[PDB]
């Protein structure tokens, strides 16, 4: 396990905003009734460990709940939390360059219902044929949905699955992480 180089690294918290930053990372959290992560930019995704010297709220942190995984330079921090979401082990981290936020992917809807599949590897909103998957679900997640945006389009959090996944043999053309 390598630690991330901390020469250009920074962390800062003020009135309603907290930022863990690097050369290529920008992880922004905010307070609305709760401190929680809100947006995150990755020029390049790396494999080092974020040092706790530059980490806010680093006590009592569950690895299962850090949105950005520890093995991918995720700060071990309660600022790295989002209610209704667990660690994004199988997000679209292969994109290299991506933006993560909480908003709907273009042309799609997300509803909270237990009539949904369990969480799994993140899925692109367009299939391998390019068809758009409109309706999405989550068992126990919170809205707005966890969203990734990258060169090949928009992806959803592990918790978010196609509402009609069991229909039309959708699984055969899904684009997955």
């Amino acid at each position: 396990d390598v630690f991330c180089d901390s020469k250009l690294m920074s962390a800062a918290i003020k009135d309603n905003r907290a930022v863990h930053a690097d050369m290529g990372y920008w992880i922004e959290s905010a307070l609305n009734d709760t401190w929680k992560i809100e947006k995150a930019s990755f020029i390049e995704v790396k494999s080092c460990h974020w040092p706790k010297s530059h980490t806010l709220w680093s006590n009592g942190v569950l690895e299962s709940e850090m949105i950005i995984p520890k093995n991918f330079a995720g700060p071990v921090s309660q600022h790295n939390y989002r209610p209704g979401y667990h660690t994004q082990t199988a997000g679209p981290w292969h994109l290299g360059s991506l933006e993560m936020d909480f908003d709907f992917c273009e042309g799609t809807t997300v509803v909270v219902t237990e009539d949904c599949g369990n969480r799994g590897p993140s899925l692109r909103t367009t299939t391998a044929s390019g068809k758009l998957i409109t309706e999405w679900c989550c068992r126990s997640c919170t809205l707005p949905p966890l969203r990734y945006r990258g060169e090949d389009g928009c992806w959803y959090g592990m918790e978010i699955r196609p509402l009609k996944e069991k229909e039309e043999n959708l699984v055969n053309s899904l684009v997955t992480a």
Partner: antibody, heavy 120, light 112 residues
Framework: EVKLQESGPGLVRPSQSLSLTCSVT?????????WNWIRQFPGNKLEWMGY???????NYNPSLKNRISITRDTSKNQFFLKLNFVTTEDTATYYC?????????????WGQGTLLTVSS | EIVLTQSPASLAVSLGQRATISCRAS??????????MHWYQQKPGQPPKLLIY???NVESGVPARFSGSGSGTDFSLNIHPVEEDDIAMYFC?????????FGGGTKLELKR
């Protein structure tokens, strides 16, 4: 989901210009897909005419290079096909279509098509 | 321009039997191990509808009686067992090079 719909006149006089509209619903034309125009002649032959990218760059079939122009209106979520001139050989059914750029690029979406007759 | 030749132009077929349509490209359509060739069905008064993408992948929602095969310059669409709903026109299309081009079409007609 994504729907395409063509619109325009069903009848245009020879040697006059031609303007076709494709209205896109359920997805913004500024991401994901390339937006193409394809026509089908009475004998069922299909000819790909051109596309405009989600970043607004067009690419045209050489058979039409000097008479074709594909533009877009992002505020109305439409794109447009223009022929500087038409003859009676351009009588055909004109379709709008799209393919997702980061795929093998099959034409997954088509409009209903609009009949265009070129006659005097 | 990549020229696609479809064969035959018209195919007579019995319900329940196997139908095979061929499309041959003038140059290779492959790109990084993927064959950039697609198959469409068209009914009268309707736009073409995607049946097979990348020349062996059945589109979601397309019945299992459709299949695709081939590589390089030679490709095949396969329908078995043929049903009444399959009496229609079929087209191949290449996306390996611009300008994109279609095959001349194949009419699947009922045999008698």
């Amino acid at each position: 989901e994504v729907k395409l719909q063509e619109s325009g006149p069903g009848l245009v006089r020879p040697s006059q210009s031609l303007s076709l509209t494709c209205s896109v619903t359920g997805y913004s034309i500024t991401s994901g897909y390339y937006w193409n125009w394809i026509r089908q002649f009475p004998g069922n032959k299909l000819e790909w005419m051109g596309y405009i990218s989600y970043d607004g760059r067009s690419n045209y079939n050489p058979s039409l290079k000097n008479r074709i122009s594909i533009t877009r209106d992002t505020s109305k979520n439409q794109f447009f096909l223009k022929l500087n001139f038409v003859t009676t050989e351009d009588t055909a059914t004109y379709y709008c279509a799209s393919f997702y750029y980061y795929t093998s690029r099959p034409l997954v979406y088509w409009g209903q098509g609009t009949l265009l007759t070129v006659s005097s | 321009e990549i020229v696609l030749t479809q064969s035959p132009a018209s195919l007579a077929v019995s319900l329940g039997q196997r139908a095979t349509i061929s499309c041959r490209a003038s140059e290779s359509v492959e790109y990084s191990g993927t064959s950039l060739m697609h198959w469409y069905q068209q009914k009268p008064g309707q736009p073409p509808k995607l049946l097979i993408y990348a020349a062996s992948n059945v589109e979601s929602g397309v019945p299992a009686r459709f299949s695709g095969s081939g590589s390089g310059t030679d490709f095949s669409l396969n329908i078995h067992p043929v049903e009444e709903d399959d009496i229609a026109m079929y087209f191949c299309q290449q996306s390996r090079k611009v300008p994109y081009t279609f095959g001349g079409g194949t009419k699947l007609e009922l045999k008698r």
